[PDB]
Design a protein around this ligand. Sequence first.
Ligand code: TRP
Ligand code: TRP
Ligand code: TRP
Ligand code: TRP
Ligand code: TRP
Ligand code: TRP
Ligand code: TRP
Ligand code: TRP
Ligand code: TRP
Ligand code: TRP
Ligand code: TRP
Lengths: 68, 69, 68, 68, 68, 67, 69, 68, 69, 69, 68
Amino acid sequence: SDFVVIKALEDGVNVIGLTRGADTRFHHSEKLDKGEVLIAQFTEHTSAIKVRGKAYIQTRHGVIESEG
Amino acid sequence: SDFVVIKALEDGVNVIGLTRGADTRFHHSEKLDKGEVLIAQFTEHTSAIKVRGKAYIQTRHGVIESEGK
Amino acid sequence: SDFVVIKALEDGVNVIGLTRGADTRFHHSEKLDKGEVLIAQFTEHTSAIKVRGKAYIQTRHGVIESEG
Amino acid sequence: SDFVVIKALEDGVNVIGLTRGADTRFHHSEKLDKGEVLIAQFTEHTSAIKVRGKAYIQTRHGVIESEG
Amino acid sequence: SDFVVIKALEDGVNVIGLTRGADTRFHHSEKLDKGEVLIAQFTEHTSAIKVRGKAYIQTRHGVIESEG
Amino acid sequence: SDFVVIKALEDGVNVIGLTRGADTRFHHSEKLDKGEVLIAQFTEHTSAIKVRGKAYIQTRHGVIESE
Amino acid sequence: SDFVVIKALEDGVNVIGLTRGADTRFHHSEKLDKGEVLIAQFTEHTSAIKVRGKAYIQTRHGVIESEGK
Amino acid sequence: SDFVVIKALEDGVNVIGLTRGADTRFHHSEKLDKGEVLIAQFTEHTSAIKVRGKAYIQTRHGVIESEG
Amino acid sequence: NSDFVVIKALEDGVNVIGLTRGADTRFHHSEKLDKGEVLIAQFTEHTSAIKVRGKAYIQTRHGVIESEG
Amino acid sequence: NSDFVVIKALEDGVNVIGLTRGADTRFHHSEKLDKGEVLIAQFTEHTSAIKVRGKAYIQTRHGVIESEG
Amino acid sequence: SDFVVIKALEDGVNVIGLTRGADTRFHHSEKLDKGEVLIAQFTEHTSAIKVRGKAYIQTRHGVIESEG
Ligand SMILES: N[C@@H](Cc1c[nH]c2ccccc12)C(=O)O
Ligand SMILES: N[C@@H](Cc1c[nH]c2ccccc12)C(=O)O
Ligand SMILES: N[C@@H](Cc1c[nH]c2ccccc12)C(=O)O
Ligand SMILES: N[C@@H](Cc1c[nH]c2ccccc12)C(=O)O
Ligand SMILES: N[C@@H](Cc1c[nH]c2ccccc12)C(=O)O
Ligand SMILES: N[C@@H](Cc1c[nH]c2ccccc12)C(=O)O
Ligand SMILES: N[C@@H](Cc1c[nH]c2ccccc12)C(=O)O
Ligand SMILES: N[C@@H](Cc1c[nH]c2ccccc12)C(=O)O
Ligand SMILES: N[C@@H](Cc1c[nH]c2ccccc12)C(=O)O
Ligand SMILES: N[C@@H](Cc1c[nH]c2ccccc12)C(=O)O
Ligand SMILES: N[C@@H](Cc1c[nH]c2ccccc12)C(=O)O
């Protein structure tokens, strides 16, 4: 099952898990300080992940960068 | 299951999930502001995804770019 | 399960689902205006997809372009 | 399942599905006008596909061109 | 399931399905005229295919040409 | 399931299927004349394939030629 | 199932497992001192992993580095 | 299941199937005359294959030759 | 059919520590390696994370990495 | 569907030995190859390790290796 | 299921199978003399393998050498 890597490029990056299912809203927000890395899967409860704030992101389709 | 990466290139971008099944309609519109990235799967409930607004998009088939009205 | 990426290159492009099953008829026509992108799977309900109008198309077999 | 991409290079191209099963006959003929693109799977009902008319075709095996 | 692509390079090319099972015989022969393409799967009923007549053939193993 | 492509390079080529199972014998021989191509899977009934006569063969492991 | 490799580049690096399921919380924090290596899977109990502290990280998407505190 | 290609480079080559199971013995020898090709799978009944005589052999791990 | 890691000890007394799979996380075994020995160790029903202490050359599917003592 | 090894005897009296799968490990069969004969042998429900003695050219999915008598 | 290739570079190389399960101990040691090769799988009974002595080793992750 797929995962994304998120490296925070500043304090307070917000990695937001959206609920899997007929309804969509966020069910968890994990904040990262600058330099921290989160490696997070798609799961039974999370089917979309949003990143807010400056982050360096890797997925199976390559590198992408969120800007705050 | 496959996923698409969408990075908003201006405020107010909408990533719209279309319902899976005989019926086709919008069930959710996720609004993205400039700089934010959404990584969204295809799912039991979403079998097509539409992107309105300027965005940089990656899928397994490569990069594509949506342009806004 | 695979999908196809369609970027509309002018207004009023139609992405048409054809029904899976013994019967083949339309079922849904999604209208894309210029610059909009639709990323659409093959599904229990859709086993063929037609594009009408000018669009840039990506599949697992490469790029192809429809013309209006 | 595998799918084929067909781009009509002239009007009245026919993409014809042959029935899966002991019997082989045409169950459906999809007419493409010049410039239209059909992306069509193999399915429970369709185990062979025939293209009549000038078209550009992609399959997992690469490009091939049908001629009028 | 695998498929073979056949482009007829002359009229009257025959793509012949051989029966799956203890018995081997021809259950169908599809006639292609010049420039027609047939994309044909292996199936529950067809476990070998024979091409007779001049054609350009693609499979997973690459290109081969039959001659009349 | 995998397949073999055989192109006959002369008349009279035989593509012979061998029975799956505890016992091994020929259950079918398909004759190919010059230029005809057969594409043949391994199956419930055929676990080995013999080619006799001159033909160009392709498999997943590349090209080989019978004489 | 996928795994990540983490090599601590200073003392006191934490490798933190987040719970799988509807509830998300830390359920374990593995402390690495400098030069130690942990190779950790995703599991029935861990669906996300956070690294805090200076570390060299390998995943199937390649090399990433966490930067300390 | 994997398969092996054996092309006999002299008459009398033997392709020998060894029994699957706790017992190991030869259950069949297929004799190949010069220039014959045999394409043979691993099966419920055959878990090792021995070749005797001069032959050009292909497997998933590349070319090897046997010599008489 | 799980993944495995290759650990070659570059000095005596390297420890390859298996961590328990499941809701709880603890060391269930430390295999001690002397210099020049190679351990090839899978992830398993009982081991979902592996810690290496001491100097070792390591290979996994994501490449080479080295632990330091 | 299992993996297999190709063994080409480079001298007479080469032995390809099958070791039993399961809690008990012993030799259950030894196949004698004379010079230039080839054996293509799978791992099986009965054979979970294969030992080659004598001079032979071996191909696995990991590449070529050679045994020396 | 994965396997390791071990080529003894001196006499008395010991290939040691460790028990799968909650407990860890060795359940078999297979000694190799110089120039013998052992191709050993991971199994229902062996989930870790230790090599002692000078040996050339291939795994899916490449070559490694043990030093005795
Ligand atoms: N609840 C939605 C979340 C989602 C996933 N991908 C999407 C694409 C667009 C809009 C919403 C979504 C679902 O599981 O389907
Ligand atoms: N409800 C439709 C959504 C869809 C997916 N792919 C499409 C292609 C064309 C039109 C509609 C669709 C379905 O699941 O089939
Ligand atoms: N209803 C048809 C749709 C179809 C898919 N592929 C085709 C190719 C040709 C003609 C029709 C089709 C089916 O499910 O089989
Ligand atoms: N009814 C046939 C259609 C077919 C598929 N591949 C073929 C090859 C040759 C002739 C017929 C076919 C079948 O399902 O098997
Ligand atoms: N009825 C045969 C057809 C066949 C497939 N491949 C073959 C190779 C040789 C001879 C016959 C065949 C079968 O299903 O097995
Ligand atoms: N009846 C044998 C045929 C066979 C397959 N592969 C072989 C290799 C060698 C000799 C015989 C065979 C079987 O199914 O096993
Ligand atoms: N007992 C934990 C061990 C573990 C695996 N990967 C981890 C990542 C971080 C922290 C703990 C772990 C589990 O099976 O899930
Ligand atoms: N409990 C959450 C943990 C998680 C995984 N991926 C995430 C992405 C964003 C936020 C939370 C998560 C889950 O298993 O789904
Ligand atoms: N009995 C242990 C053996 C093992 C596998 N990999 C390990 C890593 C470290 C320590 C022990 C092991 C198990 O099956 O899990
Ligand atoms: N009867 C043995 C045959 C065998 C397969 N591979 C081997 C390797 C060595 C010795 C014997 C064999 C088995 O099925 O397991
Ligand atoms: N009977 C043992 C044989 C074995 C396979 N791989 C090994 C590695 C080392 C020692 C023994 C083995 C097993 O099935 O597990």
